[PDB]
Amino acid sequence: APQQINDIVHRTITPLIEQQKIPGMAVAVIYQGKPYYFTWGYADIAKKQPVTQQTLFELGSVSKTFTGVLGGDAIARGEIKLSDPTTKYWPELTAKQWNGITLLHLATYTAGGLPLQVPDEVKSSSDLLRFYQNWQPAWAPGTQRLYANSSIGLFGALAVKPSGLSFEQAMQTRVFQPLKLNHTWINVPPAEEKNYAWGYREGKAVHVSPGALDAEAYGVKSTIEDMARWVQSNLKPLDINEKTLQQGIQLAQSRYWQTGDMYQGLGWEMLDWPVNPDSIINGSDNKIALAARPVKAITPPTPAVRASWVHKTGATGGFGSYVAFIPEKELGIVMLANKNYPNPARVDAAWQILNALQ
Ligand SMILES: *[B]([O])([O])C1=[C][C]=C(/[C]=[C]/C([O])=O)[C]=[C]1
């Protein structure tokens, strides 16, 4: 890789690994449309397996970006509309609090207070229905944003309903495959277990536990190569030959709501570039990102803005990931680690690297 990239990457990530005690890490910088990889440490401390470009990391919530696109693809196919009420695809949802709550609200965390976590006790199709029937919105729809798995996770599940495909099958067929993300999984197959890094929490090795709507909200695992490719796809969707997917990607980067200087897309979150570091850094901390906040509707939604910083953080009990890219500069970065460390440190590192390249 050009010495410039190599130097800024190493000057930035090295102190990060030491300060945060990150066991293993992979980074990818997309510069002028070309990917450059970097790896450090361990995928498995006990078995001394190093992190390589083939190592799989839990993406955590970055999986929400895949769900936003799959959803957008469904829209481009005319299978769903964001303006359709939730009940059009789940008539069994009869509780009156649901009238007025649209797929857009589920996709954008603006239904009125759906919780972050779906309860552990919710493990079946009937439990899920009961959970949503019983939920009580604290606010009218489309007024406040509350980042939630139970919100976009339901969006993902309802969105693939007309396809007649399972969520995993829709995702494989309509997103992973066309984009050649061949080492990206919702369920890691036996043959790939050997490249599946262990997550580290409090020094103990861990892997994400199964849960309701996990595939739709935080259940994707991937390699630094597939993630770099996922970034290039979102940077330049017009290169995607599959029509509905191309649209879908564009749709996920449209601006539906604004809160502070942040705009909510489908999965992705965007800010106008040039952007202020403190604004994206302080803004990413789990004190702002998860908090209840009023939103102003963007009527109608602004189509994907090329001069934007598009990003998303992700975390599981054992993993910390981050994706950020600037379409107008053909610039992006992917940071995957098997330790869940503070969001501000990720965004800080990512900004130091990308700013240094325009
Ligand atoms: B992201 O990363 O942000 C996320 C993921 C996951 C969660 C939860 C889970 C449970 O259930 O606990 C959150 C968030």
Curated annotation (Swiss-Prot):
Cellular compartment(s): Periplasm
GO biological process: antibiotic catabolic process; response to antibiotic
Catalytic activities: a beta-lactam + H2O = a substituted beta-amino acid
Domain of life: Bacteria
SUPFAM superfamilies for the chain: beta-lactamase/transpeptidase-like (SSF56601)
Activity regulation as described: Inhibited by the beta-lactamase-blocking agents avibactam, enmetazobactam, relebactam, nacubactam, vaborbactam, taniborbactam, zidebactam, and beta-lactam-analog boronic acids, via a covalent binding to Ser-61. Inhibited by non-beta-lactam, benzo(b)thiophene-2-boronic acid (BZBTH2B) and various cyclic boronates. Not inhibited by clavulanic acid. Inhibited by O-aryloxycarbonyl hydroxamates, via cross-linking of the active site Ser-61 to Lys-312. Weakly inhibited by citric acid.
EC class (word): hydrolase
Stated induction or repression of this protein's expression: Can be induced by beta-lactams. Expression is not up-regulated by the non-beta-lactam inhibitor, benzo(b)thiophene-2-boronic acid (BZBTH2B).
Binding locations of a beta-lactam: S61, Q117, Y147, N149, A315, N340
Annotated active site: S61
Effect of T67I: Increases activity about 200-fold with respect to cefotaxime. Reduces activity about 8-fold with respect to cephalothin. Reduces thermodynamic stability
Gene Ontology CC terms, in alphabetical order: outer membrane-bounded periplasmic space
InterPro entries attached to this UniProt entry: Bact_CellWall_Synth/Modif, Beta-lactam-related, Beta-lactam/transpept-like, Beta-lactam_class-C_AS
EC number from the UniProt entry: 3.5.2.6
Keywords from the UniProt entry: Antibiotic resistance, Hydrolase, Periplasm, Signal
Impact noted for substituting N149A: Lowers activity more than 6000-fold
GO molecular function, one term: beta-lactamase activity
Subunit details: Monomer.
Note: The class C beta-lactamase family has a specific amino-acid numbering system known as SANC, for structural alignment-based numbering of class C beta-lactamases, or else the simpler name structural position. A multiple sequence alignment was used to derive a consensus sequence and then the consensus was numbered taking into account insertions and deletions. This allows use of identical numbers, e.g. for active site residues, despite differences in protein length.
Function summary: Class C beta-lactamase which confers resistance to penicillins and cephalosporins. Has benzylpenicillin- and cephaloridine-hydrolyzing activity. Has weak cefuroxime, cefotaxime, cefoxitin and oxacillin-hydrolyzing activities.
Record-linked NCBIfam families: bla_class_C (NF033085), BlaEC (NF000185), CMY2-MIR-ACT-EC (NF012173)
Family: Belongs to the class-C beta-lactamase family.
Name of the protein described by the UniProt record: Beta-lactamase
Source taxonomy: Bacteria, Pseudomonadati, Pseudomonadota, Gammaproteobacteria, Enterobacterales
Gene encoding the protein: ampC
